[PDB]
Design a protein around this nucleic acid. Structure first.
Ligand SMILES: Nc1ncnc2c1ncn2[C@@H]1O[C@H](OCP(=O)(O)OP(=O)(O)OP(=O)(O)O)C=C1F
Ligand SMILES: [Mg+2]
Ligand SMILES: [Mg+2]
Lengths: 412, 555
DNA sequence: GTCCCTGTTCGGGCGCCC
DNA sequence: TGGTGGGCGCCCGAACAGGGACTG
């Protein structure tokens, strides 16, 4: 016996009209089972073509599992939905969560079906289940409850969420519980063991109203600083690269100067000629190398503006990333390491990289970054879902990155 | 009969009104067709005589059907369609024979007057107002509206397709193991039942359909392999396409060509080897569908190649879910590619061709990665899994590319096939500067005003050249300079550029380009033994980039 | 700002199905 | 003979969308 709360689109905007992409047999079989079940439970309803909207659906098989999770891609509906977010939330972001020894992530998606959705908004949550080899036209549903993965779902359910959490927070003050979309982030400084014991204990209170992973250790995350090569002899080539790197880096740290080095290269020299470094050049190289230590000054997180993430493939399983909102104004620079084997899958690796990076962003600023992916669109969109494990999905775009920036952030 | 199914609610778009567009002049043979159609439809409640309370109207005409005996009443709702709301189409794609499994028993059913069996929303019927012009001394004459779905309206296909799915749901739920491929009003029904139990099951399907207002005449494909379905003919163990006949016009025009490609493309789903590059190229700036043009010695050549492959007989087979899927790809020319998909060695499931040009510059490995992509997505639609690949490219060549390439690129589980032509990289840029190779500092400037330019180099060994170009661009003058350096250097060469544009194109190892300049650069690069491209920031006094810069800047 | 150059989307035509 | 609809596919040209380099 609960009342529906009205929700609207941003002015001048219409609901999503995004075509469903091809799904593998295993996924379609799972969706058809999940959906028949959600239809019984009255949580979604079948609809016709006269509803003009659409949003893609797929499915994932979390960890080693025989349990699938429906995943509706709502980031277009979310992009379009009333600023519910920056208006109807009294929510600051738990600054301490990023410091916590161990954070665990919980999938409180089920909790949302317990609330109905504004009848007038239902139209916009439509999706379409494909069949194999198009044996059938698509089967279309719209939501009746709060959709998982929708921006309005934590907002509408905020208060009810507070009620349930409230008593748990009171008895555990040093446990910080943060919520993002379908996600509950739970951090503590408990000995690994007592922490899980305590987590199982929150999940015990959570079974009381009705009706994942892995394990995060935020304070072990760290930054990948820009760094200069150290050589016992330098070639014209070695120095030409070095000046270019510094020159660009000076756009980030304005303390970097390249003049004394740039004058070891006067004339028209062969690339493999060795130039011994003059006292100044040598010292100036030492200045810069330290300047790079210093933290980037003057960088302030603005929630109104969107988070940009860039990723460069460094090869041999290395990946480097930066998070900025304004050019050269990085909030965080990192690298992601992975298996150096022979059977490396770049695309798997890229999507594990975006999930890690997204995860850090949520934990640190409680927001999702817009990624610039160094992959071809079609390639990326062919496989990324075979590797996804998050319940959210970040915005993205694909880019042809200059072989320059890849070296700017390179490691040693 | 009319289906007792609930209607689908249908609006005009806000602010708009219904069509007021008067009939046009209709043939005598078709008015005879149209009234005979209408008076029976109206007996059956499918349409209703309207009166002058109905402001609206929309033109009508009549074409024949497949057999060419029956007539089809179309309505040109071009205006109403613009005025009608949007739909989401539910037909996501086109079923394919190669995705069918072997069944013991097969039936193909068609529904009679399909559209005219589904009710149209009551509130919307008044916009479908049309008028039959009758013989001109015996009435103005007759005016009708639709109570069922019209043929020419933008919403009919999707409302039919959705209404059918609704209607079949109970049967499908009751018969989870009879497979019904559903295409518009087309039904293919397969079972693992024996002929006579299948028959009984088919009649149940028909009673079920008929309870919902859908009739099935014959037109019932029975103990009748080969079945005619979707433009194919299916036999128990093999499928093939109904005959394809390419035109033979001697003067070819755009429109003639565009339909030569069409049938060829269509053809390529099971005739291996088809190519249409040259032909498609004919069709460039030709601003008119009528424009004729001679088939280039190259094109007229190509046309004759396919034209030969269609002469040989060919079938596909059906899909065994317990064997693997295998895509084999082979290389042609001009970024043209063919593939075949099978589970057993010489038994095609189907085939196809990839041949897009993605990008102004590229190479075989990329184009191969893209055909892989295409085929993968296609397999997921048809069989819902990914095939294993047999590719004409060495594991080594792959690893080199993926180690050099700064993008994330990947190919599914695959295996090499000695079938030439093999896919190769035609050259490899050095990682380190080359000892004992002359060092070229190149640069070009262009005067954005005049369009005049200079490309040129200066070398550590004292040589320097400057070339004035006319009608150029910075990026061009800068590519030109690299081209000068390659031209005048030995088999090994270091080149230092300040242009990211150029470095970016060349780094990525193109072997084809839309740009002749880049093509020439490519010929040069492949001829060389070692090349090392280094970059430096411009206008920083670095030498001897400073030297070339002063030199090509006489503008 | 202006050029460039490259990528994308969209529409149009043709094929095929109904 | 003209003249209708929706789906997918293929090409090609349009319009954009970006980045990078320029001017003085
Ligand atoms: N050229 C077209 N323009 C617009 N719409 C078209 C067109 N060609 C097909 N259609 C749609 O397909 C449907 O065709 C169904 P079939 O062709 O099996 O015929 P029947 O009327 O259902 O009955 P029967 O089997 O008793 O003859 C009806 C439509 F309107
Ligand atoms: Mg029919
Ligand atoms: Mg230059």
């Amino acid at each position: 016996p609960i009342e529906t709360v009205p929700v609207k689109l941003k002015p001048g905007m219409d609901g999503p009209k995004v075509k469903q992409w091809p799904l593998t047999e295993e996924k379609i079989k799972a969706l058809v089972e999940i959906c028949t079940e959600m239809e019984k439970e009255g949580k979604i309803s079948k609809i016709g073509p006269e509803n003009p909207y659409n949003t893609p659906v797929f499915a994932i098989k979390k960890k080693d599992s025989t349990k699938w999770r429906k995943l509706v891609d709502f980031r277009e509906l979310n992009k379009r939905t009333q600023d519910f977010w920056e208006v109807q939330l009294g929510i600051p972001h738990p600054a301490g969560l990023k410091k916590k020894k161990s954070v665990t992530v919980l999938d409180v998606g089920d909790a949302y079906f317990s609330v109905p959705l504004d009848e007038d908004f239902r139209k916009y949550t439509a999706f379409t289940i494909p069949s194999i080899n198009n044996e059938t036209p698509g089967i279309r549903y719209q939501y009746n409850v709060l959709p998982q993965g929708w921006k309005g779902s934590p907002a509408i359910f905020q208060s009810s969420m507070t009620k349930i959490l409230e008593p748990f927070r009171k008895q555990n003050p040093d446990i910080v519980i943060y919520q993002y979309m379908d996600d509950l982030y739970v951090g503590s400084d408990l000995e690994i063991g007592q922490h899980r014991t305590k987590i199982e204990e929150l999940r015990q209170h959570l079974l009381r109203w009705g009706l994942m992973g892995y394990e995060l250790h935020p304070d072990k995350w760290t930054v990948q600083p820009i760094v200069l090569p150290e050589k016992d002899s330098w070639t014209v080539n070695d120095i030409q690269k070095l000046v270019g790197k510094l020159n660009w880096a000076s756009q980030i740290y304005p303390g970097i100067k390249v003049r004394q080095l740039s004058k070891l290269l006067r004339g028209t020299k062969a690339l493999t000629e060795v130039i011994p470094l003059t006292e100044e050049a040598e010292l100036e190289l030492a200045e810069n190398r330290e300047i790079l230590k210093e933290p980037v000054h003057g960088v302030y997180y603005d929630p109104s503006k969107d988070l940009i993430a860039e990723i460069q493939k460094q090869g041999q399983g290395q990946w480097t990333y930066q998070i900025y909102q304004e050019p050269f104004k990085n909030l965080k620079t990192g690298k992601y390491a992975r298996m150096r084997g022979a059977h490396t899958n770049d695309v798997k690796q890229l999507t594990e990289a975006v999930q890690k990076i997204t995860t850090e962003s949520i934990v640190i600023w409680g927001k999702t970054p817009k990624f610039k992916l160094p992959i071809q669109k079609e390639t990326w969109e062919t496989w990324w879902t075979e590797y996804w494990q998050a319940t959210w999905i970040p915005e993205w775009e694909f880019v042809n990155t200059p072989p320059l920036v890849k070296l700017w952030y390179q490691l040693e | 009969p009319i289906s007792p199914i609930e209607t689908v609610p249908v609006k005009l778009k806000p602010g708009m009104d219904g069509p007021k567009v008067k009939q046009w002049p209709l043939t005598e043979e078709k008015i005879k067709a149209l009234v005979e159609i209408c008076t029976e439809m109206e007996k059956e409640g499918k349409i209703s005589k309207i009166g002058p309370e109905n402001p609206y109207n929309t033109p009508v005409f009549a074409i024949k059907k497949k057999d060419s005996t029956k007539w089809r009443k179309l309505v040109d709702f071009r205006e109403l369609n613009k005025r009608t709301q949007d739909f989401w189409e539910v037909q996501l794609g086109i079923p394919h024979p190669a995705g069918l499994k072997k069944k013991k028993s097969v039936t193909v059913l068609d529904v009679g007057d399909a559209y005219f069996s589904v009710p149209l929303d009551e509130d919307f019927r008044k916009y479908t107002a049309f008028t039959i012009p009758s013989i001109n001394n015996e009435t103005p004459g007759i005016r009708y509206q639709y109570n069922v779905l019209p043929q020419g309206w933008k919403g009919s296909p999707a409302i039919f397709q959705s209404s059918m799915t609704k209607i079949l749901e109970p049967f499908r739920k009751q018969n989870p193991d009879i497979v019904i491929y559903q295409y518009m009003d087309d039904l293919y029904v397969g079972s693992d039942l024996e002929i006579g139990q299948h028959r009984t099951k088919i009649e149940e399907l028909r009673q079920h359909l008929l309870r919902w207002g859908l009739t099935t005449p014959d037109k019932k494909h029975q103990k009748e392999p080969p079945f005619l379905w979707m433009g194919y003919e299916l036999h128990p163990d093999k499928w093939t396409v109904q005959p394809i006949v390419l035109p033979e016009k001697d003067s070819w025009t755009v429109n003639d060509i565009c339909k030569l490609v069409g049938k060829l493309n269509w053809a390529s789903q099971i005739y291996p080897g088809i190519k249409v590059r040259q032909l498609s190229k004919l069709l460039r700036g030709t601003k008119a569908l009528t424009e004729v043009i001679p088939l280039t010695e190259e094109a007229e050549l190509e046309l004759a190649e396919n034209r030969e492959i269609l002469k040989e007989p060919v079938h596909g087979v059906y899909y065994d879910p317990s064997k693997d899927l295998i895509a084999e790809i082979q290389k042609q020319g001009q970024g043209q590619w063919t593939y075949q998909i099978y589970q057993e060695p010489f038994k095609n499931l189907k085939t196809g061709k990839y041949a897009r040009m993605r990008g102004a510059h590229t190479n075989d490995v990329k184009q191969l990665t893209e055909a892989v992509q295409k085929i993968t997505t296609e397999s997921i639609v048809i069989w819902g899994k990914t095939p294993k690949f047999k590719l004409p490219i060495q594991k080594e060549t792959w690893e080199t590319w993926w180690t050099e390439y700064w993008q994330a690129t990947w190919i599914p589980e695959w295996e090499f096939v000695n079938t030439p032509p093999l896919v190769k990289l035609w050259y490899q840029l050095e990682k380190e500067p080359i000892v004992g190779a002359e060092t070229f500092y190149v640069d070009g400037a262009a005067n954005r005003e005049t369009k005049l330019g200079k490309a040129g180099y200066v070398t550590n060994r004292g040589r320097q050249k400057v070339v004035t170009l006319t009608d150029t661009t910075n990026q061009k003058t800068e590519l030109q300079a690299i081209y000068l350096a390659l031209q005048d250097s030995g088999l090994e060469v270091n080149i230092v550029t300040d242009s990211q544009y150029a470095l970016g194109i060349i780094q990525a190892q193109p072997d084809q380009s839309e740009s002749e300049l880049v093509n020439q650069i490519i010929e040069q690069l492949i001829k060389k033994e070692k090349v090392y491209l280094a970059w430096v920031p411009a206008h920083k006094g670095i030498g001897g980039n400073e030297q070339v810069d002063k030199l090509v800047s006489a503008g």
